[PDB]
Write a protein that binds this ligand. Structure first.
Ligand SMILES: [Cl-]
Ligand SMILES: [Cl-]
Lengths: 106, 107, 106, 107
């Protein structure tokens, strides 16, 4: 539903269901802080310029974060495979040892 | 390193300082943003500036969600490690308990 | 307490607590069968000869069985160490990945 | 291979057929048995034959107990493997559940 959002001296209108209002307010706070930080460190003063740069940075951040998620999953997958591999080893070793028959002399 | 790169976002030219080893990421980010702004435009009085603000809000939210995914992975894995580590201590306890046994005789 | 045990036509007396009587009867059955088996396969017919050979064989069996126990334990110890090693790997990998900070352009 | 070896057990000479690669085990078994019979003798009318019967009973019992140890190890390990394998399937289930998540947007 329609919501008016304030960011960096600007007034936005965003359509947003109630169960996403809180997410919207956080994103507004996040972006507000991003623009204020970007500014104090890059000497750029124009607001439109700042928002293009911030949008670019944050797209790149999202790309990185998505790579991180893939990397986490790929890594833990490998650990799970090793755990599995340790299990079949335990079973192979158990078979090897227990299947030995005690010898006699005659 | 790090020189200005001329980037075209949605009918706007802007300069971004960027080292060569990030250039490819910069090209991909501009491509991602351009596609995002275009798809947003057809979905929605499109002052380009306000359009970029809305795109940036969406990306902020998506980033927050993406970060929650790894947080959620980590939280699950924390439980898995706990269970594994107890199984390990129980195996150690059991190994000790059985190895301690002494055979008896009759006489 | 005193118990009279019958093995291979011979009459033994063995001092044995009640909570070991059942073990004694099994050992008597085990040995009875060992002597009957040893005989059908080695053509030795003297009983005293048979029992010396059986006692020798079974000492060797016990040595082997004790080695088996040591081998089982040593092997499973190694599996436990690998399980442990997989855990610190999961934690090292987690640290490596999660401690990466998303970069920006400016 | 396998020739007769002259073994002395407790004042008795006997021949045991034994290949070279078991000779060392045979020497150790005769040494073990000799020590066993001697320790049993001081503990106990010592017809040597009856003494060997009693030694053999003790060894049979000790063997049964020793075998029970590995049986007991194996039984414990069976439980440990079960717990590990459930942790593994739960990790797989959890990995799937989290990776399936899709980021939402506002507009
Ligand atoms: Cl968007
Ligand atoms: Cl004994």
């Amino acid at each position: 539903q329609p919501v008016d959002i304030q960011i960096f001296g600007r007034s936005l209108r965003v359509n947003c269901p109630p169960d996403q209002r809180d997410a919207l307010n956080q994103a507004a706070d996040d972006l507000n802080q991003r623009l204020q930080d970007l500014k104090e460190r890059t000497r750029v003063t124009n607001t439109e310029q700042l928002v293009f740069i911030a949008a670019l940075n944050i797209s790149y951040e999202l790309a990185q974060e998505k790579a991180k998620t893939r990397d986490y999953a790929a890594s833990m997958e490998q650990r799970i495979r090793m755990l599995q591999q340790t299990i079949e080893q335990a079973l192979l070793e158990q078979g090897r040892i227990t299947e030995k028959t005690n010898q006699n002399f005659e």
